[PDB]
Design a protein around this ligand. Structure first.
Ligand code: HEM
Ligand code: HEM
Ligand SMILES: Cc1cc(N)nc2cc(-c3cncc(CN)c3)ccc12
Ligand SMILES: Cc1cc(N)nc2cc(-c3cncc(CN)c3)ccc12
Ligand SMILES: C[C@H](O)[C@H](O)[C@H]1CNc2nc(N)[nH]c(=O)c2N1
Ligand SMILES: C[C@H](O)[C@H](O)[C@H]1CNc2nc(N)[nH]c(=O)c2N1
Ligand SMILES: [Zn+2]
Lengths: 413, 410
C-alpha cells in the first residue's frame, strides 16, 4: 500500500491525509474487485497466535504513555511472555484494560459519537464468578451511567474467554429493551425486533405482563453455565414519555422510550484477549429512536398512525406524507428528552462534532477509521456535514466485534 | 465464490455470481475500504483483448456465440486494430454498449429503465457546429414536451488524445453562477468557474439568478466555441407549493431535463470523451441537493423563515422541516405541469424490483449504497435496508478531468 491516503470534503474543500491505515490489522471483506461496504456483517487462540498479538498491543500501550523501549516496557513484555508460555494466556494490568477499552471505542468505525472516547468510565469486573454477581455489576453500571438523567458513558468488563466452554455472556442485545409478543393472528405486541429473545425469556420462566412497553429481564451467563433470569429494579430504568411541543394529541399515542442505550452483545478484543461480556453505554442520538426504533416497518411502525392524526394525504407517495411525519416524530423525541433533562443529541450537533473530531484525529493521530454508511444519519443525510465528507474505513485493534447469539452455540447443561 | 446479499427488512437473500465477471478495480483493498471516495485513484496491444471481450459478450447476448457471424466479426476487428491502431463499432454494437453502460452504472437508482434508451449516433461529427446541431436534436427529442424520454448522443471516439471531442459543460442545461464583488454568489455556486470561463470567451451574462448557460463545445481537439440553445427547446418549471401560497414568491424555478455531459463512455476499449445522456429527475436531486446544499442555492434559511420556524436551536429540526416542504413543492410543480419526475419512494421501490429482476436473469447487479440511498429520509426507503455489492463491469461510464485543466489553446 502507498504511504499516504487523502480524503476530501466536497463542501468545504478541506483535504486530510491518512497514515494510520498502515496499522490496519484485519481484512474488511472488500477486495480489489468488489466492495462489501454495505454488508452488515462481512475454539480459542493458541500460544503461538497469542504471542505477537500481545506484543503488538503492549508496544502500542507503552508508546501511548511515552515509555517505549523503557525498562518497564521490556519487563512487561517478558512477564506477558512467561505468562503465555506457562498458562497459555495472560492477564491485563488495570491501566492496560482501561487503555484497551477506551481505544476500542476510539477505533469503532461505525460510531458517530467518538469525540467522547477518552471520557469513559471503566468498571473492572474480572473478579465476577456468578450470574447473580453479573446482575450486581450491571445494576451498578446502569445506576452510575444513568445518573438521574445526566448520562455518563461507561463499560463493564466481565472475565475474558478461556477455553470457550466457560464464556461469560449477557444474552440480551441491550441491557434495557422492550418485549415483543407474536400474536396468534400475525400481529406483534410491543417491539417486533425483540420477539425471538422474549420467547427465550418466557421459556426460561419469565412471566410476561404482555404489554406494549415491558422492560425485558436480564438473561445472564457466567463461566459457561446455563443463563439465569433477573429483574432490573424498575426505579433504575429511566424512561421518557414522548410528547410534541405543538401537537397536543401526540401524547395520546402512549409512546415512551428508555434513556440509556446499552449494547450488551458485542465482544471486546484487547491484545488477542476476548471479552465476550462487556456491556457499554453512552447516550442517544435522537434519530436512533425517532427514525429507526419508531418508524422502521419491522419495528414500532407508527408512521401511519401519526400521519393520520396529522391529517395527511396518504394515497400518494409523492405527497411525501411519510417524510413529513418522520420529522415531527423526531422533533417530539428530542423535545421530550430535553424537557426531562435526559441527555440526548440531535443528528446535526452529533455529525458536526464528529467532523471536528475526525479532523483532530487526522492531525494528531494520522487518521480516523469511519464507516460512512453508518455515520450518516437515517434522515436528512445530505444536510448534515458527514454526507459530503470522504471517509476511509479500516479495522484497528483493540476493537469491538460482533459475535454469534449465545443460544445458537450454548451447550445446555 | 458465490456471494449473498440480504435485505434486513424482508429477510430476502439474493445470490451474486455476476461479480465474478469484472476485471476493473474498485479502489478498495482487503485492508482499506474506500466505498465513500468519490473518485478513487491506449495501444494496439492493449486494445484487441478488450475488443474481443466486448464482442464475445455481445454475441453471447444475442445467442449467437461461436456462430459464423461472431468468428468473422472478431477477425474483422483484429485486422482493423492491426492496420489502423483502433476500430469502429457496428451500429448494433454501439446501441448494445450504451444500454449496458447504463445497466452497469452502480450509482444509478434509475436502472429499471435501462433497455429503454434512445441512442443517437453522432460519430460522423467533425465541428463544434455539428455538435451543437446534434445536441439540439437530443434536447428536443428527450424533452418531448414534458413526457421525457431517455437518450444519449455519442460523438467520435478518442484517437490520439490530441483531438478529443468534449462538451465542457458538466450538464447541457445549467444556470450561471456569478462571484459578487462583496463576496457572495449570484445564481448557482457549482458553476461559477465554468461561468467565468464562458465570460472570458465572450459570453454576455444577464447576471441573474437563473441564466441558462451557453454550450461550450470542443471538436477534434480544437478550441471550444460558444452556442446559445434556442430558448423554446429549454423546458422549465416554476416551483410552487400546494399549501404555501407564498412559495411562488421565492421566485424559484428549475429545468425539466437532467442531461449530464461531462462523463466518458467506454466500450470494448474505445473511449467516447463526449457523450451527453439524459433521463428524468428524481425529486431530491433538485429539492435536496440543488437547493439546500450550502455550496449550492442554500435556500433552507430563506424557506424556514417564511414558515416562521424557530431557527435558534438545531434540535427544533427546522432544517428538516423546510427540506421536506421544498421537496413537496418540487414534486407538486413538475407533476402539475405534466413534466416527468419520480419521488425517491417510488424510485427506490423500482430499484429493489430491478435488483430482483437482475439477480434472477443476470446473476447480480452492481450497486453503490452510498449513492443509491436518497439524500433525505434514507431509512424509510427500501434501499436503506438492502445490502448491495459494488463492482465495476464494462461497458461503462467513467469520470474524466475538466478539459480546461488540460487543453492547450490555439
Ligand atoms: C456517548 C454518546 C454516543 C453516541 C451519541 C453514539 C452514537 C452512535 C450511533 C448513532 C451509532 C449507530 C447505532 C445504530 O445505528 O444502531 C453507534 C454505534 C456504535 N457505537 Fe457509539 N455512541 C455513543 C457512545 C458509545 C460508546 C461509549 C461506545 C463504546 C465504548 C460506543 C461504541 C459503538 C459501537 C461499537 C457501535 C457499532 C454498533 C454496531 O455495529 O452494532 N458508542 N454509536
Ligand atoms: C430515466 C430516469 C433516471 C433517473 C430517475 C436517474 C436517477 C439517478 C440519480 C438520482 C443519480 C444520482 C446522481 C447524483 O446524485 O448526482 C443517478 C446517477 C447516474 N445515472 Fe441515472 N437516472 C436516470 C437515467 C439515466 C440514464 C438515461 C443514464 C445514462 C444513459 C444514467 C446514468 C447514470 C450514471 C452514469 C450515474 C452516476 C453519475 C456519477 O457517478 O456522477 N441514468 N441517476
Ligand atoms: C454505545 C451506544 C450509544 C448509542 N447512542 N447508541 C448505540 C447503539 C448501538 C446499537 C447497534 N446496533 C444495534 C442496536 C439496536 N438497534 C444498537 C450500540 C451502542 C450504542
Ligand atoms: C442521467 C441522469 C438522470 C438523472 N435523473 N440524474 C442524473 C444525475 C447525474 C449527476 C451525477 N453526478 C453529479 C451530478 C451533478 N450534481 C449529476 C448524472 C446523470 C443523471
Ligand atoms: C463523500 C461522499 O461520497 C459524497 O458526498 C457522495 C455521498 N453520496 C452521494 N450520493 C449521491 N446520489 N450523489 C452524491 O453526490 C453523493 N455524494
Ligand atoms: C444494508 C445496510 O448495510 C443496513 O441497512 C445498514 C445501513 N446503515 C446503517 N446505519 C446505522 N447507523 N444503523 C444501521 O442499522 C444501518 N443499517
Ligand atoms: Zn469497500
Amino acid at each position: 500500500c502507498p504511504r499516504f491516503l487523502k480524503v476530501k470534503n466536497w463542501e468545504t474543500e478541506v483535504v486530510l491525509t491518512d497514515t494510520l491505515h498502515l496499522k490496519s490489522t484485519l481484512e474488511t471483506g472488500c477486495t480489489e474487485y468488489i466492495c462489501m461496504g454495505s454488508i452488515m456483517h462481512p475454539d480459542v487462540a493458541t500460544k503461538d497466535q497469542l504471542f505477537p498479538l500481545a506484543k503488538e498491543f503492549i508496544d502500542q500501550y507503552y508508546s501511548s504513555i511515552k515509555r517505549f523501549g523503557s525498562k518497564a516496557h521490556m519487563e512487561r513484555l517478558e512477564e506477558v511472555n512467561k505468562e503465555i508460555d506457562t498458562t497459555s494466556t495472560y492477564q491485563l494490568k488495570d491501566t492496560e484494560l482501561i487503555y484497551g477499552a477506551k481505544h476500542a471505542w476510539r477505533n469503532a468505525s461505525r460510531c458517530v459519537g467518538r469525540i467522547q472516547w477518552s471520557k469513559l468510565q471503566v468498571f473492572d469486573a474480572r473478579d465476577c464468578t456468578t450470574a447473580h454477581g453479573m446482575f450486581n455489576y450491571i445494576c451498578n453500571h446502569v445506576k452510575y451511567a444513568t445518573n438521574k438523567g445526566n448520562l455518563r458513558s461507561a463499560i463493564t468488563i466481565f472475565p475474558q474467554r478461556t477455553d470457550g466452554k466457560h464464556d461469560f455472556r449477557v444474552w440480551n442485545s441491550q441491557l434495557i429493551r422492550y418485549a415483543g409478543y407474536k400474536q396468534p393472528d400475525g400481529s406483534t405486541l410491543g417491539d417486533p425486533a425483540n420477539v425471538q429473545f422474549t420467547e427465550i425469556c418466557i421459556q426460561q420462566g419469565w412471566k410476561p405482563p404482555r404489554g406494549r412497553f415491558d422492560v425485558l429481564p436480564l438473561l445472564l451467563q457466567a463461566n459457561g453455565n446455563d443463563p439465569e433470569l433477573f429483574q432490573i429494579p424498575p426505579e433504575l430504568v429511566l424512561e421518557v414519555p414522548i410528547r410534541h411541543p405543538k401537537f397536543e394529541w401526540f401524547k395520546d399515542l402512549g409512546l415512551k422510550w428508555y434513556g440509556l442505550p446499552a449494547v450488551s452483545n458485542m465482544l471486546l478484543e484487547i491484545g488477542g484477549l476476548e471479552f465476550s461480556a462487556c456491556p457499554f453505554s453512552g447516550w442517544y442520538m435522537g434519530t436512533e429512536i425517532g427514525v429507526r426504533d419508531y418508524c422502521d416497518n419491522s419495528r414500532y411502525n407508527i408512521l401511519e398512525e401519526v400521519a393520520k392524526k396529522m391529517n395527511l394525504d396518504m394515497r400518494k407517495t409523492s405527497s411525501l406524507w411519510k417524510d413529513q411525519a418522520l420529522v415531527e416524530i423526531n422533533i417530539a423525541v428530542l423535545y421530550s428528552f430535553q424537557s426531562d433533562k435526559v441527555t440526548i443529541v440531535d443528528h446535526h450537533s452529533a455529525t458536526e462534532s464528529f467532523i471536528k473530531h475526525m479532523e483532530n484525529e487526522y492531525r494528531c493521530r494520522g487518521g480516523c477509521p469511519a464507516d460512512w454508511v453508518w455515520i450518516v444519519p437515517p434522515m436528512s443525510g445530505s444536510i448534515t456535514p458527514v454526507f459530503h465528507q470522504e471517509m476511509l474505513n479500516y479495522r484497528l485493534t483493540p476493537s469491538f466485534e460482533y459475535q454469534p447469539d449465545p443460544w445458537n452455540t450454548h451447550v445446555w447443561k
